[model samples]
Target: DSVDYRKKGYVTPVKNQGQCGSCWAFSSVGALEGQLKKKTGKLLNLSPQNLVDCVSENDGCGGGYMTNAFQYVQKNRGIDSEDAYPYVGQEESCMYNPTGKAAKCRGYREIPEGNEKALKRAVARVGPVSVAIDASLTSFQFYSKGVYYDESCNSDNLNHAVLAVGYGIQKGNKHWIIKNSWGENWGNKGYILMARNKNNACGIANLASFPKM
Candidate 1:
C-alpha cells in the first residue's frame, strides 16, 4: 500500500516564512501553495500568513500542531495571505475577520495523525507532507554551511517543524530529503537530507500527516 502511494517530487528550500512557529501552517500550505503555479502556470504566493492569522481554534500565534491546524482549515473553509489578512510573524493581537473572509478557511482533507503509511501515501498521491520535527537539536541560532549531522544533539531537541518531500540513498545510506522552514542560508539550501529507514532518532520515520483523499 505504501509503495502504491509513493510519488517522487522535489523537496524545496526552507523558508523562514518568518518568526511564526507557523512552520506547521507554512509546511502544510507550502506543499499545495506551489502546486497552483506548477499546474496552471499561475504564480501566486499563497499566504501562510493567512493560515496563521485566520485558522482560529488552533493556537495560531503561539505554537500548534499540524494535524489540528489542518483540521481548523478544513472546518473553517481555508486561509488567505498577508495581502488579504497580513502577518507579522511574532505573536500579535488576533485580527478577527468581520467580512467572513476568514470563514473561507475550510477546504482541506482530514489526514491521519502519525500515520507514516498514510503520510507516504499522501505525499505520493497528493503533494508534500507538512510535519512537526525536533529542530531544537541543532544550533539553529547560527547558520551552518554544509550537511552537518551531530550525533550528540538530542534528536528529541529537534522540536520545530519541516516538510518530507521524498526519500533516497546517499553513498549506500538511505535518507529522506526534507525542506526546512528556516531560511536558504541554513543547511543545504534550507534543506536537510536525513537518515531514513534507520532509527527514528530524527523522527522522519515516526512523523505523520493528517491523511489522504
Candidate 2:
C-alpha cells in the first residue's frame, strides 16, 4: 500500500520517446535499467534504439509489444546504449552488431492480467515494471495530477506502454507512479499517477510485464 521505488534510487532519469511511437521499447528499457541497477548496483543507460532498429520480432517506432522486445534481447544477449546509438525520434536501418555497447537481457516475466496486488509485490520485491495501457483518451494525454480515472478508459483499446516504478496511497486514493517516454514537461515531470485498483482503467492491468536479468 505504501512504496516508492524511486525513493530507493532504483529508477533512472526520465527518458523521451520523441516523435516516434516507441513507447513499448522505452518501457522495456526502463524496467531493465531498474533491474540492472537493483541487482548489480551499477546503473547503465541501455538503448531503446537497439530494440527499435534491431529487434525484428517487433516493430520499431511503428507499434510493438514489450514482451517481444525482451525475447529479442534474450536471444541476442547484447543491446547497445544511448550514447552510441542515440535516439533519432524516428526509424532507421537495423544494426545488429555495434561497438561500445554492453547491457544484456537474459529473459523476462509477465505479471498475468495485471493483478494490482501482484504488481505491488513485483515493485517491492522484484523490480520496476514495464506495462502496456490504453492511452487513447485525451484525459490520459493531459493527465497532470491526482489518480488517473478517466471514465472512457477501456482495457480493450490498449495501445500505449509505460514503466511503473511504484505505488502508494495519496489522500485516500491509490495510484501507480508511471514513467513516460514523452518529454519531461508532459506530466509530473514525465511521470503520471495512474488510477490503481480501478478495474484496470486504461488497461494498466493487462499485459503487465518486465525484463529478467
Candidate 3:
C-alpha cells in the first residue's frame, strides 16, 4: 500500500553552511527544520548555528556524520535558541554558552541502507530523515529557472549535505522532497524535488536517521 505521507508544509529557503564543510550540521539541522514545522504546526526557521556553535564533539564547520551530530545534541539535552546563538553559516571557533538551556535532539531511528522501498516506508512511518550525498553540486544546471543541478563546480568533492522531507511522484517520475540551505532564492522556492530512483541519488544512496531503540 502506498503510504500517504503528509507534506510537512510548503517549501522554504535554506542557507548554505558554506565553505565550513559542516555538512553534519547542515543535514541534521535540515531534518530539524522540517520537524519543527511538523511538531509545532508553526514554521520556525531554527538556526544551524545553534547546532554548530553549541553542540560539542561535532566537527565544527568541517565535515561530520549525521548520526554523530544527533548523538551530540541528544547528550547535550538540546540546542540553544536561534535568537540567542544565531546561524552565521561559516567555520568559526565554537563559542560555548555556559548558561544556555540545551534542547533534546529527539533522536531518530536508522533506515535500511540502499533500500528505497524500505526507506520510503520508514519516511512515511517516521517524519523527516537526515541524508548525505556526493556534494558535487554546481550552479549552472537549471531545472526550474534559478535552480541549478550542475555538479561541475562542486569539485572539492563537497559531498554536500541535505535533508529528505518527503517523497512523491511528479510528471510520472518519482522524486524526493529535499530541503536545501542555499536560502529561499534558489530552486522551487528554496526546495528541489530530486528524482527518487534516478541515479540512486535520493534514497538509493546515503544514510537516513534511525534512532536506536
Candidate 4:
C-alpha cells in the first residue's frame, strides 16, 4: 500500500525557511515530528530553530546536515516544541532550555545510497525521511507540479536537504511526496512529487536518513 504521512496526520503544517539555508534543520525536525507522532500519537511541531541555534557542529542558517542535527537532539535528550522556540529564519545563540513537552530521538539511521526501494520501505515503515538531493537545477527551483523528473539533475551533487513524507503512483509514474521548508507557496502547497524508482532522480535516495524515536 502507498504511504502518505500527511493523510495519516503524522505531518505538521508546512513551515517557511525564508532566505535562510536551514533546510537541513527543518528536514531533521520534520522527520523527527513524523516519527514522534507515529510512536506516541501526539503530533507536535518540534522546533527546527532548536537545531539551527543549538547544534554547534552545524552551520545553522548557512547550511547543515540532518544526521548532525539528529545527533544533537540525541545528546540533548530532546528538543522544544516550535511554540516554545519558534523559527526565526536565521542563526542565533542557543536558547534551548529542555523544558515543556520535549520530543526526543534515540538517533538516526541512513538508507543505502541510491536505493529508492530502501527509501520507499523507510517511508512506508519508518515515517518521514530526511534526504539530500541535487536541488541546484533551475527546473527544480521552479517546480510547480507533476512527477518532477529533470535529466539535468546530478545524482552525485546533492546540495539541499528535504523530507520525503510519502510515496505512491501518479497516473502510471511512481513519485515521492517531498515536504520542503520553503513554505506553502512552493510546489503543491509546500510539497513536490519527485520521480521515484527512476534511477535515483535528483539524488532523492542518495543520502537518505531518518530519525529514530
Tell me, by TM-score, which candidate is best: 4
Separately for all candidates shown, the number of backbone clashes (residues 3 or more apart, or on different chains) is 20, 1, 21, 0
Measured against the true structure, the TM-scores of the candidates, in listed sequence, are 0.70, 0.95, 0.75, 0.97
- How are the candidates ranked when ordered by TM-score, highest leading? 4, 2, 3, 1
Q: Over 4 Å off in model 2, which ranges?
A: none
Tens digits of per-residue lDDT for model 4, 1-213: 688889898899898999998999989989998988889887888898989999999898889999999899998998999899998888889999877546888989999988998988889889999998998999988999789999998999989999999999988889999999888998889998999988999999988999888
Candidate 1 regions with alpha-carbon error over 4 angstroms: 1-14, 34-43, 93-119, 139-158, 210-213
Task: Show pairs that collide, candidate 2.
Answer: 17-181
Question: Per-residue lDDT tens digits of candidate 1, residues 54-116?
Answer: 666656756666666567555655545435666567655555453434223233554453345
Q: Top model by lDDT, which number?
A: 4
lDDT score of residue 3 within candidate 1: 23
The true-structure Cα RMSD of candidate 4 reads 0.9
Cα deviation of 143 in candidate 4 (Å)?
Answer: 1.4
Compared with the true structure, what per-residue lDDT tens digits does model 2 show for residues 84-157?
A: 77777777897756574557777888887858778778777887898888888888899888888888888988
The candidate, 3 or 4, that scores higher on TM-score is 4
- RMSD (Å) of each candidate, 1 decimal: 5.0, 1.3, 4.4, 0.9
Q: Which ten residues in a row have the lowest lDDT in candidate 2?
A: 94-103
Between which residue pairs do clashes occur in model 4? none
Q: Where does model 4 exceed 4 Å of error?
A: none
